Amino acid sequence: XSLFVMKDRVILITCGTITLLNCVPLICEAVSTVCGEVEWVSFMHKNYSFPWEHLSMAEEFKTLRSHFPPFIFGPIDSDHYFLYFHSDAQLSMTMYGLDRNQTKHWYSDKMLPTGPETAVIREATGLSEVVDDSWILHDLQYEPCGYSINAIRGSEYQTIHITPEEHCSFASYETNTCALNYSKCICGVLRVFDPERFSVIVFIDPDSAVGKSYHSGGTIGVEPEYYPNYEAHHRTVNEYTPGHWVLKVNYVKRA
Amino acid sequence: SFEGPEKRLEVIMRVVDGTHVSGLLAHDDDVWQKVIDAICAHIVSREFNEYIRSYVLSE
Ligand code: NA
């Protein structure tokens, strides 16, 4: 996969390609040709892996540096890293151990873009409830397996990527939708995947709506009262650079 | 091919004095086709609105 382009940003998500850092030079050129200024670059990099789940940190940092002629660098959460060139909402889920009755629908002997076949898939799995008819959607079912969907609604997007290999099945969800309480959104995605474990990462800057709520003690939809079939573990909040905050919650299905 | 692990890249620009009124939406698909070529992928389908150009991709 997915590329989203907005007035001030580009988001690229893929599964199984070569390094996305290859795209940085041409994205920077696209910025300079419209006389914008690069402010943030972030990329996923796995330093630490768990059993249910590339270049070294040094190699990726050196590559990214090579694509620029100053900035600050560091982690966001432990799996994403930023460059900030000093002079909105984002919620993400990662899901492991997907429902086996659902994952069969994301196997196929043919590559199928949006059409009657993916309509059957979306209806049968409940993706149609996550991406309802208020969204403009397009999707792709891969051979032998895998699935991607993008959806847009005004300034909002949602996207899901599914890699259902039995050994280490995985799905991700991301959205910039603004809600005061994300429990309905998150639980709607869990309805589709019913995963053995999942994490949610939410950005909570104090000057954003959800962050203003969080920083004042408000309930934002990640809390344990919404996930009775799961046990919470190791909530982590970081002010990952001055003024900017990230929250990660982790849930594991009750055996 | 399409299989784990997932990768993600985001670039955010500041709109400043002198930036094109449309920002990155001043560009047409030729710009983004070349970006996607750098990861040896291609555009399978597109959906556009006033705020977002959305592309579904494949190797
Ligand atoms: Na929690």
Residue numbers in the entry:
A (entry chain A): 401 to 453, 458 to 473, 477 to 494, 504 to 671
B (entry chain B): 27 to 85
What does the paper say about this structure?
AdoMetDC is a pyruvoyl-dependent enzyme that catalyzes formation of decarboxylated AdoMet, a substrate required for biosynthesis of the polyamine spermidine from putrescine. The AdoMetDC pyruvoyl group plays a key role in the catalytic mechanism and derives from an autocatalytic processing reaction that cleaves the peptide backbone into β- and α-chains. Trypanosomatid AdoMetDC undergoes this cleavage, while the corresponding pseudoenzyme, which we call ‘prozyme’, lacks key residues and is not processed to the active form.
Like the Δ16 mutant, TbAdoMetDCΔ26 had low activity either as a monomer or after heterodimerization with prozyme, and both were modestly (3-fold) more active in the presence of putrescine. TbAdoMetDCΔ26 yielded crystals (space group P212121) that diffracted to 1.48 Å resolution. A single TbAdoMetDCΔ26 αβ-monomer was found in the asymmetric unit composed of a four-layer sandwich with two central β-sheets positioned between outer α-helices. The N-terminal β-sheet (strands β1-β8) contains pyruvoyl at the N-terminus of β4 (pyruvoyl β-sheet) and is composed of residues from both the α- and β-chains, whereas the C-terminal β-sheet (scaffolding β-sheet) contains only α-chain residues (strands β9-β16). The inactivity of TbAdoMetDCΔ26 is explained by an autoinhibitory mechanism mediated by residues S27-G30, which block the active site. The G30-P31 peptide bond is in the cis-conformation, orienting S27-G30 into the active site. This configuration places F28 within 3.8 Å of the pyruvoyl overlapping with the active site of the previously reported HsAdoMetDC structure. The TbAdoMetDCΔ26 autoinhibitory residues are well defined by electron density and form extensive interactions in the active site stabilizing the observed conformation. These interactions include, π-π-stacking between F28 and Y243 and H-bonds between the side chain of E85 and the backbone amide of S27, and between the amide of G101 and the carbonyl of E29.
